[PDB]
């Protein structure tokens, strides 16, 4: 008997966002080095494409668009959470942190 794992709910067909532990959360532009990562957190497979033109979701991959993979969550040494995106781990913060922090940027890809 061992209970310790919650399924992450992604917005789907939308920008970077998700809810964990009944709490709103999103992917930030802040990236954390593997050396800071403690270990795996959650295993999921999600991929989508967004156009940098209007920052909207699409159905195909164009030159004016960039693919984004929101998944592969990991833990940090400071109990911080992060998600894997394009071989790059980006820290995740609650939507309540808005005002001073914003979602990640596709320019990093």
UniProtKB/Swiss-Prot annotation:
Keyword Signal: yes
Any one biological process term the GO annotation gives: bacteriocin immunity
Recorded GO CC terms: plasma membrane
Localization (cell): Cell membrane
Keywords in alphabetical order: Bacteriocin immunity, Cell membrane, Lipoprotein, Membrane, Palmitate, Signal
Residues in coiled coil: none
Source species, domain of life: Bacteria
Purpose of the protein: Involved in immunity against exogenously supplied nisin.
Protein name in UniProt: Nisin immunity protein
Classification lineage: Bacteria, Bacillati, Bacillota, Bacilli, Lactobacillales
Gene: nisI
Full protein segment contained here: 21 to 129 of 245
